[PDB]
Amino acid sequence: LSTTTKYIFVPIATIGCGKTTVFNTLNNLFPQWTHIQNNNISKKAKLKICDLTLLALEDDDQSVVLFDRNNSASRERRQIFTTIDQKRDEHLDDTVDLKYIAINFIPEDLSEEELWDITYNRVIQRSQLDENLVESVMKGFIQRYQPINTSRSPDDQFDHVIHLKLSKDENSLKSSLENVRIIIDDLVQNFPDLIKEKPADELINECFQKALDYKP
Ligand SMILES: Nc1nc2c(ncn2[C@@H]2O[C@H](COP(=O)(O)OP(=O)(O)OP(=O)(O)O)[C@@H](O)[C@H]2O)c(=O)[nH]1
Numbered sequence: 001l002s003t004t005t006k007y008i009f010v011p012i013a014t015i016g017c018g019k020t021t022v023f024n025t026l027n028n029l030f031p032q033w034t035h036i037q038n039n040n041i042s043k044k045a046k047l048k049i050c051d052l053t054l055l056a057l058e059d060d061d062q063s064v065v066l067f068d069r070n071n072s073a074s075r076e077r078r079q080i081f082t083t084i085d086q087k088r089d090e091h092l093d094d095t096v097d098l099k100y101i102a103i104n105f106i107p108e109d110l111s112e113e114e115l116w117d118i119t120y121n122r123v124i125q126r127s128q129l130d131e132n133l134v135e136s137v138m139k140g141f142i143q144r145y146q147p148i149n150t151s152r153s154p155d156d157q158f159d160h161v162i163h164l165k166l167s168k169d170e171n172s173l174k175s176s177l178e179n180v181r182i183i184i185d186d187l188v189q190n191f192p193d194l195i196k197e198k199p200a201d202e203l204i205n206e207c208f209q210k211a212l213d214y215k216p
């Protein structure tokens, strides 16, 4: 109306960390949020994910973009900050305040061995030349992975970091469901004007079930 705040949720992740499951759950809970999936964008598309992000924040209707891309490498985070900062005046007036929230999918203390075991088994459970290609692309995102470091450029440009968990499921609780709850609780504490009514636990569970059973 006079000063509007918008949010870009940026994962730091590798393949199969649950980015899309977490973001689909959130979008099921919050239909007005915009989930942009880098995987669904043609690498010969005119508008790339940073362009679509700014387009999806133009209307007063639109306040959250779920930026669904791995960003395992530091330079991929730097691309987001620089590109959006350079182009935001093409589409947004000066009353719009943009906040970058990092969603960290890979805990500081997780070994590369455990990261691989968890994500590789998730991905195989969802053409042997096919499998070797999948394994090799997954290894490339892990090879390039540089943990978040808000003490140095570029991660010091994040306004906030939400730290997620990454474990084998225990006590029949999927870690992505736990992470959805972590994000919602963090937002209601740290950005109370974003989520008005904290959704009921039953609704979160059902929105997660929908995302989990989604078969593209
Ligand atoms: N067991 C278990 N499976 C999960 C969990 N979260 C997601 N999955 C499954 O793991 C697979 C990968 O999850 P995605 O949400 O697609 O992960 P992603 O990070 O988006 O991976 P990419 O799109 O390939 O980059 C899917 O089959 C999910 O249903 C979880 O917490 N526990």
Ligand SMILES: [Mg+2]
Residues within 6 Å of the ligand: 019, 020, 021, 039
């Ligand atoms: Mg995905």
